[PDB]
Design a protein around this ligand. Structure first.
Ligand SMILES: CCCCCCCCOCCOCCOCCOCCO
Ligand SMILES: CCCCCCCCOCCOCCOCCOCCO
Ligand SMILES: CCCCCCCCOCCOCCOCCOCCO
Ligand SMILES: CCCCCCCCOCCOCCOCCOCCO
Ligand SMILES: CCCCCCCCOCCOCCOCCOCCO
Ligand SMILES: CCCCCCCCOCCOCCOCCOCCO
Ligand SMILES: CCCCCCCCOCCOCCOCCOCCO
Ligand SMILES: [Mg+2]
Length: 549
């Protein structure tokens, strides 16, 4: 789709966002037959996801060679709570059934959102406008089972309700049960309100029990020139392993405005966050109270063939104090349908609980800091939409353990040089969506490649319909990756060879109300790991259906 909200919080055409952007819709997710968020993200440019096995197991997201803690994940605009204790986003627990849209914008965005937005930003949206009720379910390899009931209806004029329940289970397993309710209200044709509440109960296998609930409420104004939003959020998670218990409550309040001025816009906002942990959470002795407040400004202008886009933010954190970030981009459409874009931006990552207050803690840590430069050419040629970008990311003040003193300090440096190339085009009835990433991510002090990241990836999606059958084939090449073997000491660095992977999916409208679908994932039964030592699934079959009325 064309409109995004994730670049500056407010709706704008993608063509006007100078950073590389990707949008995934629910229609996309339904066709691909993804059974996890990771399976969605894995398909997209610059994404390198590793996982300790199959569904539900611990996983890491490396966007454009950056550390796992250097991606900002938002759910409906607000920092994912599950990232809260460890200070690093893991989506393996977040229910796929709740995903209605993903908006993913690469490059820095601390200047809008604050901490973590270094490699990029991933915004998982849970809202839909899609009247009706749906029942669906599926069955697959490894005793995979799913069923789900969902309904959105009008409760008179101005108010609409959404209700969802979902059960997902797999064995070696992982069991996830989810409930979601939302109420939306139009006071007028410009003033809106919403209240949202959801929660899930996950069990994974040593056993993990994870409870998470989130409540959001807000008010929005959508006028001809002026747009505003006041947004409230509360998330509570309890993560049991066995025993340890990690428990965090996260409080968010944000107020943002934006106005259309000429061929462009200007915006500002204030963003407050409180996180509270329980004693013994995150292997820290005491319970902690962390607070952050940020203020920022955005801008977009089009003059002639040129486009200018920018943001700047000041954050005040209860532990490290004040840190400012900014970014600026310019695009030149030098000939119709072609653009050169140049970008610069700074971003940062806040120290986490363990690093500050754990056994090896240092309460005076400063943030990790990033500087990025990016240049791109984008075009439309002979029916092909394409883009190629080169970026450099210098990361400094990395928080590292010193074995000399058994404490964490700011000191490491990394340098990432990367290339992203993308294209989409049709050939008769066939649709092609392709990307290539080169990622040269290095310790800038030793000049050694960083571990766990593939230097090269190729991803290819091929879609077409013939009789009434909707077919999709997905191809991925995962390049070579260096990792450590933790089965025994000492921990040896190993070299995992590149692998090719293929998936095949089909759908068919049995009626206008009933759609049946099947999928064979890892069609050639390739044996491979994304984390050394941890076996992935192998060839799996899934058969599913959805009935709408
Ligand atoms: C009235 C200010 C609104 C935009 C401020 C955020 C921009 C932060 O850096 C921009 C300054 O750096 C050079 C700006 O050059 C072009 C300005 O960007 C145009 C935004 O409308
Ligand atoms: C590297 C030095 C830092 C320079 C800071 C520059 C501050 C930005 O000032 C330029 C602002 O220009 C336009 C501001 O935003 C206007 C948005 O819409 C304007 C309508 O035409
Ligand atoms: C609203 C747009 C904001 C753009 C401003 C970004 C410009 C960055 O300013 C320069 C960076 O900060 C200067 C650091 O000062 C050097 C430290 O030396 C002090 C020694 O005590
Ligand atoms: C509407 C508020 C807009 C705030 C944007 C400024 C915050 C981002 O600033 C950029 C940070 O880069 C330099 C600022 O940090 C240096 C602090 O210097 C203060 C004393 O000289
Ligand atoms: C790195 C970006 C490269 C930009 C290359 C574009 C330079 C010229 O592009 C094509 C200009 O128009 C030519 C299109 O082909 C002829 C179509 O003529 C119109 C049909 O009557
Ligand atoms: C504007 C797109 C960048 C072009 C992609 C590959 C073209 C290579 O030109 C020379 C190769 O550059 C050597 C290093 O390439 C990786 C660096 O990426 C840019 C980071 O500085
Ligand atoms: C891509 C280099 C020449 C100009 C780009 C044309 C359109 C690019 O779409 C390519 C999508 O397919 C992947 C291309 O992979 C080769 C580019 O890799 C650059 C090597 O550093
Ligand atoms: Mg020494």
């Amino acid at each position: 789709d064309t409109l995004v909200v994730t670049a500056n919080r407010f709706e704008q055409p993608r063509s006007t966002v100078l950073a590389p952007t990707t949008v995934v819709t629910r229609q996309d997710i339904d066709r691909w037959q993804s059974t996890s968020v990771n399976d969605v993200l894995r398909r997209l440019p610059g994404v390198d996801i590793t996982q300790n096995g199959g569904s539900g197991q611990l996983s890491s997201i490396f966007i454009r060679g950056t550390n796992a803690s250097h991606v900002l994940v938002l759910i409906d605009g607000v920092r994912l709570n599950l990232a809260g204790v460890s200070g690093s986003a893991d989506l393996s627990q977040f229910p796929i059934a709740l995903v209605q849209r993903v908006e993913y914008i690469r490059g820095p965005r601390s200047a809008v959102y604050g901490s973590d937005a270094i490699g990029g930003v991933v915004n998982i949206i849970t809202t839909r406008d899609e009247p009706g009720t749906e029942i669906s379910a599926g069955w697959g390899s490894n005793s995979y089972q799913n069923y789900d009931v969902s309904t959105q209806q009008q409760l008179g004029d101005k108010t609409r309700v959404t209700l969802l329940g979902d059960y997902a289970h797999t064995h070696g397993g992982f069991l996830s049960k989810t409930l979601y309710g939302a109420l939306e209200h139009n006071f007028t044709d410009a003033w809106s309100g919403f209240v949202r509440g959801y929660g899930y109960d996950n069990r994974t296998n040593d056993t993990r029990k994870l409870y998470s609930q989130s409540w959001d409420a807000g008010l929005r104004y959508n006028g001809e020139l002026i747009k505003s939003q006041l947004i409230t959020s509360y998330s509570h998670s309890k993560d049991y392993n066995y025993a340890t218990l990690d428990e965090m409550k996260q409080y968010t309040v944000q107020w943002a405005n934006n106005v259309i001025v000429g061929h462009g816009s200007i915006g500002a906002g204030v963003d407050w966050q409180k996180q509270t942990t329980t004693p013994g959470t995150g292997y820290v002795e005491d319970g902690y109270d962390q607070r952050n407040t940020g203020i920022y400004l955005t801008g977009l202008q089009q003059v002639g063939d040129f486009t200018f886009e920018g943001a700047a933010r000041s954050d005040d954190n209860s532990q490290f104090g004040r840190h400012g970030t900014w970014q600026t981009s310019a695009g030149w459409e030098f000939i119709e349908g072609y653009r050169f874009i140049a970008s610069y931006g700074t971003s940062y990552k806040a120290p986490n609980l363990g690093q500050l207050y754990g056994f090896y803690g240092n309460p005076n840590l400063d943030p990790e800091k990033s500087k990025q430069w990016e240049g791109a050419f984008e075009g439309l040629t002979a029916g092909v939409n394409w883009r190629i970008s080169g970026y450099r990311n210098d990361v400094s003040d990395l928080i590292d353990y010193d074995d000399h003193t058994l404490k964490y300090y700011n000191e490491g440096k990394a340098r990432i040089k990367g290339v992203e190339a993308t294209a989409n085009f049709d050939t008769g009835p066939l649709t092609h969506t392709v990307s290539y990433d080169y990622v040269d991510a290095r310790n800038a002090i030793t000049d050694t490649p960083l571990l766990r990241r593939a230097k090269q990836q190729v991803k290819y999606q091929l879609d077409w319909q013939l009789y009434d059958f909707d077919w999709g084939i997905t191809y991925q090449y995962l390049g070579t990756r260096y990792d450590k073997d933790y089965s025994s000491y000492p921990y040896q660095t190993v070299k995992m060879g590149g692998v090719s992977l293929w998936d095949l999916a089909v759908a068919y409208p049995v009626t206008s109300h009933l759609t049946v679908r099947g999928k064979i994932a890892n069609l050639f039964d390739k044996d491979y790991e994304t984390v050394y030592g941890y076996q992935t699934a192998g060839r799996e079959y899934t058969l599913s259906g959805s009935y709408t009325f």
